[PDB]
Amino acid sequence: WVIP
């Protein structure tokens, strides 16, 4: 999971 990432900060888009």
Place this chain on the structure above:
Amino acid sequence: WVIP
């Protein structure tokens, strides 16, 4: 396009 890339070499997978």
Place this chain on the structure above:
Amino acid sequence: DSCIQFTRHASDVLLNLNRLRSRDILTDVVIVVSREQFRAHKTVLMACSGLFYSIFTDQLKCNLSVINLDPEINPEGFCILLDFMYTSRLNLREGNIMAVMATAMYLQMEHVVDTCRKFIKASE
């Protein structure tokens, strides 16, 4: 093999599937949640959820145009997860994390359940 691969292909496909959802094009099922209705594509739901995969591979249920979820399922939690299915983006907030995790457990969306568990553990 000796294939070449287009890096953005999978993302472009999902973006186009979400555009079809937005425009209600070729949607083939209604998911009913506590009298809130969500139109979608069976194949996308199956690709994202172990529950929908099991439902639409059933010889009788594969032909249903309406699926009613368990009354304990929260429509907002479902809506957030349906958006995630079609975009890879999860709108996870302090105010919705419990409903989102409960819905992801029911829908069998293991990666969502994982990030919810981690975000909850960080706040304890």
Place this chain on the structure above:
Amino acid sequence: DSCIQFTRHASDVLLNLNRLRSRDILTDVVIVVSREQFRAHKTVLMACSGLFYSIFTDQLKCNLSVINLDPEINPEGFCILLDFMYTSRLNLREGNIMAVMATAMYLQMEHVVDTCRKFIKASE
């Protein structure tokens, strides 16, 4: 928004759509090419091809279960492109590049047409 994003989501969705294709699950159309038949999902074809997008948004054609392609279309070129649609992998070879490019132009798959043009230009 303040969404989080699961990097591998789009790829996992496409992988699952290809598994459904392999097992002939929820395929809703047959594409006929020079008497060679290919089963697929209309939504995936639309997401990948400007031609299929135009075909299945047509009020009459959206309801067809069989689509016949132009007789000049090569079944191997189509097969390679159908595999690309469901995997992001293109099996481009000296022996098939002309058929693949011609099929991608007909199907309106601009990124495929682009890499074919470049690979052809490198060999001249």
